[PDB]
Homo-oligomer: A and B are copies of this chain.
């Protein structure tokens, strides 16, 4: 049993509607206005073939930048210097206002929502997860603090071999609706999280997507809002965004907080702008100045033992759902598989968004190419 969850609509029974009940009363009043949350759906365009390259300023210092973007399967790229868009690129077939999947850049948005609730005193990071989600008793999440979930410092038996359908990584996706369910799968993401185990040790970084979904569960328990709604109220609706974001949902309506947000490149940059503005956005303060300062400061370096990160960034770390390079520029980034970054360059007051579609989720070589672009662009923005 996974306990109480926010109803899909006011008055809804647990789990309702399902794919088999949404046409029935009382669900249909809600479902007829929200059917894409139940059934895959396509846009029918109101508007009736070529890459847009507006590299600006940086084009002089980086004359081969468009080629380097193509080589890293770039879909959308945008540089915000201060409040100004100073460079943009969109591949052929991807409009400037199209949305793109964020993959684990989504985690950095979830951490932001948690930080908002920490500022309000509704979450205390020193408390055990089970203070907020007692149904995680008996799992790997029984013992660790909320801060240890925020910093991903919990050892979890979570097989990352996605070729193997019995792996946790594939099971987590199927539980959330990203793949077709197999017999015996958990019914929804909450149930999947309660199956997770580990040896009980903490304090060493282990990147694991389940942690973010636990954070979103905590957000729901403390606010009584669907994660979809909390992500809007605590973050998205404060950005003065051009478009709504979207988030995939499982069969209970729970947003896939770790990986399923999509948004435009320009709107994602507004999240970075808020972080470089000390936590304030056009619609109000999102998170405290202290929370932003802790993100920029980094996590414990000794916890960071992922050589995929520290071979490039030897003084790197992770905190509060952000990767902290520890480099001489203090760069910090949200990162997601296949080449997604929300990269902060505080020295130049700039944000770089790069949304891509590498053929592979991760290789060392794609990361070397991608980080080389992000660092070159950051350096191109320095005063000279």
Known: A36-B36, A179-B19. A48 touches B238 (CB 8 A): yes
Contact across chains for B261 and A44 when beta carbons are under 8 A apart = yes
Known: A237-B47, A247-B42. A29 touches B75 (CB 8 A): yes
Question: Is the contact region of chain A dominated by helix, strand, or loop, or is it mixed?
Answer: loop
**Stretch with Cβ within 8 A of B (4 or more), from A94-102, A141-149, A299-307, A317-325:** A94-102
Q: Interface residue tally of chain A, by bracket?
A: 35 or more
Contact across chains for B73 and A262 when beta carbons are under 8 A apart = no
Contact partner of A45 (CB less than 8 A), chosen from B35, B39, B101, B237, is B237
Contact across chains for A42 and B179 when beta carbons are under 8 A apart = no
Contact across chains for A248 and B40 when beta carbons are under 8 A apart = yes
A150 → B minimal CB distance (Å): 21
Within 8 Å CB of A99, what residues of B?
33
Q: Mark A232-246, 1 if CB is under 8 A from B, else 0.
A: 110011111111111
Q: Is A249 an interface residue (CB 8 A)?
A: yes
Contact across chains for B19 and A73 when beta carbons are under 8 A apart = no
Give bound CA distance, A40 to B338, whole Å. Answer: 21
Known: A19-B180, A99-B33. A39 touches B40 (CB 8 A): yes
A236 → B minimal CB distance (Å): 5
Contact partner of A40 (CB less than 8 A), chosen from B36, B46, B238, is B36
Within 8 Å CB of A33, what residues of B?
75, 94, 98-101
Contact partner of A260 (CB less than 8 A), chosen from B19, B39, B244, is B39
A residues 181-220 touching B (CB-CB < 8 Å): none
Within 8 Å CB of A262, what residues of B?
32, 35-36, 41
Within 8 Å CB of A94, what residues of B?
33
Within 8 Å CB of A28, what residues of B?
338, 357, 359
Give bound CA distance, A23 to B236, whole Å. Answer: 26
Contact partner of A32 (CB less than 8 A), chosen from B47, B101, B248, is B101
Contact across chains for A228 and B357 when beta carbons are under 8 A apart = no
Known: A232-B44, A283-B48. A39 touches B238 (CB 8 A): no
Give bound CA distance, A46 to B233, whole Å. Answer: 9
Contact across chains for A177 and B42 when beta carbons are under 8 A apart = no
A347 → B minimal CB distance (Å): 30
A133 → B minimal CB distance (Å): 22
Within 8 Å CB of A42, what residues of B?
34, 36-37, 228, 246-249, 253, 255
A28 → B minimal CB distance (Å): 5
Within 8 Å CB of A232, what residues of B?
44-46, 48
Give bound CA distance, A357 to B35, whole Å. Answer: 13
Known: A180-B20, A357-B32. A41 touches B246 (CB 8 A): yes
Contact across chains for B241 and A338 when beta carbons are under 8 A apart = no
Contact across chains for B47 and A36 when beta carbons are under 8 A apart = no
Q: Is A178 an interface residue (CB 8 A)?
A: yes
Give bound CA distance, A28 to B241, whole Å. Answer: 25
Excluding A36-B41, A46-B240, 17 further A-B contacts by CB distance (< 8 Å) are: A23-B338, A26-B359, A28-B357, A28-B359, A29-B357, A32-B101, A36-B43, A37-B42, A39-B40, A41-B248, A42-B246, A42-B247, A43-B244, A44-B231, A44-B236, A46-B241, A46-B244
A-B pairs with beta carbons under 8 Å apart, 20 shown: A23-B178, A23-B338, A28-B338, A28-B357, A31-B101, A32-B262, A33-B98, A33-B100, A35-B101, A36-B36, A39-B40, A39-B178, A40-B248, A41-B262, A42-B246, A42-B247, A42-B248, A42-B249, A43-B245, A46-B236
